[PDB]
Amino acid sequence: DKEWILQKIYEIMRLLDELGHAEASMRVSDLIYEFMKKGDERLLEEAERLLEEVE
Amino acid sequence: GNYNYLYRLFRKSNLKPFERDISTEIYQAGSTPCNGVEGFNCYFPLQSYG
Amino acid sequence: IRGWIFGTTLDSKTQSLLIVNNATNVVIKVCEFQFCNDPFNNCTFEYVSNLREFVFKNIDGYFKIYSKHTPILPQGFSALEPLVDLPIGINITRFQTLL
Ligand SMILES: *[C@@H]1O[C@H](CO)[C@@H](O[C@@H]2O[C@H](CO)[C@@H](O)[C@H](O)[C@H]2NC(C)=O)[C@H](O)[C@H]1NC(C)=O
Ligand SMILES: *[C@@H]1O[C@H](CO)[C@@H](O)[C@H](O)[C@H]1NC(C)=O
Ligand SMILES: *[C@@H]1O[C@H](CO)[C@@H](O)[C@H](O)[C@H]1NC(C)=O
Incomplete structure (x- = not known):
């Protein structure tokens, strides 16, 4: 499951760059770094929430 | 974005x-193994600062 | 013997430290060199200057070289003086001697 979560967060920041919202992308990237060091899956929920605010 | x-x-x-x-x-x-190819669980290691 | 290659790989990909004594001087480069399987682009450092003892150490940041030349591996004792401190921020796991 962790592998899919990392892929989803990665795709979210990639999209945020494409959408022209670099600050949101930067914030999501930070979620990736923290995620790769932890078992905390709520970082996905934050990546998704940030994307929803942008879209 | 830069x-x-x-x-x-x-x-x-x-x-x-x-x-x-x-x-x-x-x-x-x-x-x-990624073998140089991006995809599920394979990433280009560098991310830009927009 | 003219020189040495130091790095993680000796096949491009990662920067390698090449130290070569040729004719009149010593040429030191840290380019992502493509080496031959029998030796004898991206560069961050370049510098150009019987029993011969050398000591090569890789501390964080610097690559340290010590050396001593004495007249004549015979039994005896001497100490090696420092030669050069190279500010090369690379990973070294293997090396090769160039003849
Ligand atoms: C220098 O590079 C070597 C590989 O060429 C590194 O060794 C690897 O380290 C990773 C991460 O711990 C391991 O998963 C690999 O199995 C190791 N490979 C080998 C062949 O040992 C080495 O750690 C690097 N040195 C420094 C200081 O970064
Ligand atoms: C020593 O090698 C360098 C290349 O690294 C070359 O430019 C130089 O001319 C060589 N020295 C002599 C005397 O040929
Ligand atoms: C030098 O390295 C950079 C990556 O830092 C790469 O994009 C570039 O293509 C390399 N140039 C050559 C000639 O290999």
Whole structure:
């Protein structure tokens, strides 16, 4: 499951760059770094929430 | 957005003091070899600052 | 013997430290060199300057070289003086001697 979560967060920041919202992308990237060091899956929920605010 | 500046987001290990790693080899996040190809659990290690 | 190659790999990909004594001087480079399987682009450092003892150490940041030249591996004792401190921020796991 962790592998899919990392892929989803990665795709979210990639999209945020494409959408022209670099600050949101930067914030999501930070979620990736923290995620790769932890078992905390709520970082996905934050990546998704940030994307929803942008879209 | 100025996307010229890059930082490394994905790395297999931490750096030693004053070590300079400029490799662009695709990072393997999963259990399977990437062989230079991005995709599920394979990423280009550098992310831009927009 | 003219020189040495130091790095993680000796096949491009990663920067390698090449130290070569040729004719009149010593040429030191840290380019991502493509080496031959029998030796004898991206550069961050370049510098250009019987029993010969050398010591090579890789501390964080610097690559340290010590050396001593004495007249004549015979039994005896001497100490090696420092030669050069190279500010090369690379990973070294293997090396090769160039003849
Ligand atoms: C120098 O590079 C070597 C590889 O060429 C590194 O060794 C690898 O380290 C990773 C991460 O811990 C391991 O998963 C690999 O199995 C190791 N490979 C080998 C052949 O040992 C080494 O750690 C690097 N040195 C420094 C200081 O970063
Ligand atoms: C020593 O090698 C360098 C290349 O690294 C070359 O430019 C130089 O001319 C050589 N020295 C002599 C005396 O040929
Ligand atoms: C030098 O390294 C950079 C990555 O830092 C790469 O993009 C570039 O293509 C390399 N140039 C050559 C000539 O290999």
